[PDB]
Amino acid sequence: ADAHKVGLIPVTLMVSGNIMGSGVFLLPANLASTGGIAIYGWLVTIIGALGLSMVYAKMSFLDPSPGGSYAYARRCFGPFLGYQTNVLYWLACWIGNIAMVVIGVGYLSYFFPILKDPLVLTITCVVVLWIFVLLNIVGPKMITRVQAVATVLALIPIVGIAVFGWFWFRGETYMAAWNVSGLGTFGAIQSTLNVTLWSFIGVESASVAAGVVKNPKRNVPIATIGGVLIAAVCYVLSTTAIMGMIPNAALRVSASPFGDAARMALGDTAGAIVSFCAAAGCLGSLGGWTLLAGQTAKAAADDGLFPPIFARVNKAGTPVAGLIIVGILMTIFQLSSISPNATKEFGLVSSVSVIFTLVPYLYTCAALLLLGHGHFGKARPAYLAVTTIAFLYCIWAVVGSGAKEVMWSFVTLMVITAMYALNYNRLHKNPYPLDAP
Amino acid sequence: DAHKVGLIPVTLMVSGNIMGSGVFLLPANLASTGGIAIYGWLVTIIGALGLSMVYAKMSFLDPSPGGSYAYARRCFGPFLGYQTNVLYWLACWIGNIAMVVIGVGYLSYFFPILKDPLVLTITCVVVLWIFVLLNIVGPKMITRVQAVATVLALIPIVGIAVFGWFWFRGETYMAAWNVSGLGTFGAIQSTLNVTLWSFIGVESASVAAGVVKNPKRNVPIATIGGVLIAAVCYVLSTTAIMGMIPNAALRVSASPFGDAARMALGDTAGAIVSFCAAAGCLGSLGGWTLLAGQTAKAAADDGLFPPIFARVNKAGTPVAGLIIVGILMTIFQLSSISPNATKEFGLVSSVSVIFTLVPYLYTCAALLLLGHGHFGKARPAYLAVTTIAFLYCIWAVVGSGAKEVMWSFVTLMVITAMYALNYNRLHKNPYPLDAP
Ligand SMILES: N=C(N)NCCCCN
Ligand SMILES: N=C(N)NCCCCN
């Protein structure tokens, strides 16, 4: 059993990489429209993200159950909300991979412009998605080794900037675009939050993957908090640094700023390097997120709250069938990248699948208090405070999202409810049943 | 069976709670779409009957006070019960502002001063408290008053259906079959975004189950009867009016029956329709206030709402709760002192409308999860009807404004956080951790 567990370093890198992989290189561009004031947005986001990570860290220390959020929700609310949580999170997991692989293969267009052709891109994306499904089939040790390397590669430009970029940084440049939002301070900070709050999706990674982690009660907490802090530092330092090195006007326009900035400062080779590292960190995360999909689905299927096949494992314990299913699904959704008007269509689904993740977060936050009140001791005020901050993070993320996306999330909840009712009636155990027919 | 309410007032409470105010405004809202609304009415009424049958059957198997609240608590546990009651309660008393405003509106036919928004506000507050007080006097009282109000409100609706077919011209109805500019489906959809909300109130007898006489028998009958009444009148009145009045006049009009009546059979006819419409509108304030009281009481009795809402007088009436609802309604009724204040409050109201669909959904789920053992030979019917009721709730949301729904979602989240913060260590987990 322990022969197939993953150690602390890969898990931590899986969390940090699951978090940063997709957008760490695109953040300074996004925040360029608001300006330097974004640092206020970072400060607020990071405090809330620590809060959420501490919640997950403590919750997994008290219950290192596989499936993470799925397990915590089922524990304190029962089978229905477990079922719901897993559906939402699983969908979130594999639906979000489509964006990632497009971005990742996208970064590789630097070398092979052919990858800009929607057809070639789509096929390439499919192949890559399947590569990282097979690597998951080989086992979590494999996938976490690969993603560890990828994540480390992705950290080279980011840290290079965040350590040495400050020797070209200039505060005049940063403050020259302190607030280009045209809004007041709150509005600008808010507009920043609309970007920065989603930056830390994946905080729950090690918790969800607890069932393949070595000494989880020890390691999952450390990996959780550990990954989140790396993400935070890298985010603030990289975006702050770049905002003081490149003019706001240019920074806004670039579709690959570290890359645009790189290719034009230290030569073509520099740009090449940055593109490679970006693609590495991006495509590396496919593995982590695919892993998480498999895990949550398996954990739910083990309790009979998700189809049996997601529980069918090899001798190593890998849910191979589930992984292959997620592969087919991702393949089907990847077809949206074959045309400009085809990607426009899929977008809402992607953005909705992102809001899904927050229900698990919310239930995790609830679960810590509802399940672990007896372990707080008289540090209880602290726990309550941190958890309340965590709640605020979740709620505020949604408050600032698009009405349509959230609406469809709301619809999804109802649909999941009806699904559970129609699929699990007369299997489901009622808290307060009626008397015998 | 002394303080309890009989079948007739309850049925009239259901139909009255449904018909409420909108019954007189429907043709105007449908006029923008046109005669093709008939298809939407069809779709709406099938789903609405489905929902009522679900409620009918569920109340039969378990005539618990609080209705949906009780059903949801049964099958999903305290968290979703707490959630249901908060949502439905909010729905109940937030929804009353719009109602009393509309209702006092119709009375401006007699007293124009009622459109001075100040005077309007004051008047509305007073009326709200009138019905809080009548609810305090007791459920027999409130349901009697509403019964009468409901029979009065039917005078116009019925008369038109019956005598107005003598003035009905199909050439007029078909002149405006589809004035929506859309294809058939879109027309039908724009209809449904009006008509699906028409039947909010189906759950009334169920939630009131605790003050109903022989609820196991009467709440089902009342539940389905009320809906049948509502459906028939909705279709008949709107269809009739769409055939007697040109679409153009119909759209423009803010009070079609009233305007149509006034210039049909005199300044007296208008007065009668106005009076009856106001009766219908203001009569159901009582019902909804009652339902608020009931759901809150039922939840507080289970420790899933602040205990004061469970405090009662020697009759069992949640007096303090009713007063609290009165005060909140008063605080929120302050939104009608200007055209400016009025439109700020609209979102809250729409969201409040959406709140009611979560209870519906849970009730639908509860019937299957709880009563599967009572279906027997006819299981494929229960699954089929309950499925239609599911589709009813979900379609209603799909057709709503994105913002309204977003803010309902946010509310669910806030409710979750509140539950966790206020009930941790009172709350008992299905699968707890080992002791420290
Ligand atoms: N859902 C996914 N497959 N990925 C989400 C990655 C988000 C990076 N913060
Ligand atoms: N929530 C209220 N106070 N009223 C709801 C009225 C719904 C009429 N179908």
UniProtKB/Swiss-Prot annotation, chain B:
> Which residues are tagged with the site Middle gate?
288
**Listed GO MF terms:** antiporter activity; identical protein binding
Q: How does activity depend on pH?
A: Optimum pH is 5.5 or less for Arg-Agm exchange, which slows dramatically as pH rises and is almost undetectable at pH 7.0 and higher.
Q: Which residues form a coiled coil?
A: none
Q: Which residue spans traverse the membrane?
A: 8-19, 38-56, 82-107, 120-137, 139-166, 190-202, 222-242, 273-296, 319-335, 348-365, 384-399, 403-421
The way it spans or sits in the membrane comes to:
Multi-pass membrane protein
Q: What is this protein called?
A: Arginine/agmatine antiporter
* Species name: Escherichia coli O157:H7
